[PDB]
Amino acid sequence: HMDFSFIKALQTAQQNFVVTDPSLPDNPIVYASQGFLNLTGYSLDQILGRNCRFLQGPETDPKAVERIRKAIEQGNDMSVCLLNYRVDGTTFWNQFFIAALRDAGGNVTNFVGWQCKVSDQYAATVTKQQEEEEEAAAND
Amino acid sequence: HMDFSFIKALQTAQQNFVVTDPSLPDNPIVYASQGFLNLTGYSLDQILGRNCRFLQGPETDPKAVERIRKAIEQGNDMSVCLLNYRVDGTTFWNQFFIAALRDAGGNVTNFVGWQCKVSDQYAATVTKQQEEEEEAAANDD
Numbered sequence: 207h208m209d210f211s212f213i214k215a216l217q218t219a220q221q222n223f224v225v226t227d228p229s230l231p232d233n234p235i236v237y238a239s240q241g242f243l244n245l246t247g248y249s250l251d252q253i254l255g256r257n258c259r260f261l262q263g264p265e266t267d268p269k270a271v272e273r274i275r276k277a278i279e280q281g282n283d284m285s286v287c288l289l290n291y292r293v294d295g296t297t298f299w300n301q302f303f304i305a306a307l308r309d310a311g312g313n314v315t316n317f318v319g320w321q322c323k324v325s326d327q328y329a330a331t332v333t334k335q336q337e338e339e340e341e342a343a344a345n346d
Numbered sequence: 347h348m349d350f351s352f353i354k355a356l357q358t359a360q361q362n363f364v365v366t367d368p369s370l371p372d373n374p375i376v377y378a379s380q381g382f383l384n385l386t387g388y389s390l391d392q393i394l395g396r397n398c399r400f401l402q403g404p405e406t407d408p409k410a411v412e413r414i415r416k417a418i419e420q421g422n423d424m425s426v427c428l429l430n431y432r433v434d435g436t437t438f439w440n441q442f443f444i445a446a447l448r449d450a451g452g453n454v455t456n457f458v459g460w461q462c463k464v465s466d467q468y469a470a471t472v473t474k475q476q477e478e479e480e481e482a483a484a485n486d487d
């Protein structure tokens with residue numbers, strides 16, 4: 207159950223992340239780390255106030271995006287590896303974690319998204335495990 | 347280790363981390379990632395069942411360790427940059443995050459510690475901010 211301490215931790219450790227505000231229209235970015243800007247090639251001015259879906263493109267697996275979409279609807283933390291796109295259309299494997307931050311009332315005030323770029327070889331092992339988990343699940 | 351979402355995230359992202367069990371004497375390591383073993387030079391046989399304090403040595407700031415000690419006592423998540431030691435006695439700057447993980451009853455069942463190695467130059471800017479925050483605080487308290 208992560209709090210503002212998690213944002214401070216990601217910031218000081220120079221991680222790639224964004225903070226969104228679900229009380230605003232389309233749950234937009236309200237903060238992006240210098241690491242995120244370096245990873246994606248966007249300026250802060252190009253992404254502030256925008257939904258993170260601009261990272262997706264035609265080879266992104268819609269099943270991975272659906273897992274993120276459901277986690278946001280439910281306020282559930284989760285992680286998934288999926289293909290994302292830079293400002294120039296080049297791709298990277300994003301081992302992605304999303305956490306819902308709640309106030310003392312237990313209301314979700316913000317989401318944090320942490321992007322870790324992984325190698326093609328490692329992504330192939332992680333997406334194979336995800337494909338296997340997805341099948342085990344659709345058998346139960 | 348766990349079904350805790352954050353532990354799964356740290357594991358899949360190949361981070362350096364440990365999980366402890368505060369229900370056991372001296373809150374020992376019950377899980378360490380391959381990244382932690384690679385960063386510190388320890389093998390699992392040397393660290394399972396041990397308190398993480400083996401990472402400290404003479405140049406570690408005791409004020410940083412005290413902040414971690416208090417966070418554990420209170421079940422508060424926090425981060426701090428402090429000097430830590432590998433098994434061979436060589437040092438590295440550990441930008442460190444600790445989180446308390448709770449069951450449905452809200453009891454702390456585990457702590458997770460996430461170690462990010464940072465450069466001497468970057469650590470110098472972070473510890474300066476810590477020194478400045480400590481003074482600003484003692485001008486209130």
Ligand SMILES: Cc1cc2nc3c(=O)[nH]c(=O)nc-3n(C[C@H](O)[C@H](O)[C@H](O)COP(=O)(O)O)c2cc1C
Nearest residue numbers: 226257258259261262271274275302317318319321
């Ligand atoms: C904090 C946060 C971070 C996100 N980061 C990513 C990301 O790194 N990659 C990605 O493909 N989608 C990311 N998303 C997901 C999209 O913003 C979006 O929620 C998803 O595409 C589902 O919504 P849609 O169907 O309206 O596009 C993130 C969402 C949030 C709230």
Ligand SMILES: Cc1cc2nc3c(=O)[nH]c(=O)nc-3n(C[C@H](O)[C@H](O)[C@H](O)COP(=O)(O)O)c2cc1C
Nearest residue numbers: 364366397398399401402411414415457458459461
């Ligand atoms: C999950 C967890 C991870 C820890 N990781 C570190 C670390 O990376 N570096 C460190 O110097 N101390 C770390 N500690 C702190 C020590 O284990 C210990 O709590 C601290 O030295 C204060 O207690 P003591 O006064 O009994 O030594 C960690 C503690 C826990 C519970």
Ligand code: NA
Nearest residue numbers: 260261262263
């Ligand atoms: Na796009």
Ligand code: NA
Nearest residue numbers: 400431432433
């Ligand atoms: Na030692």
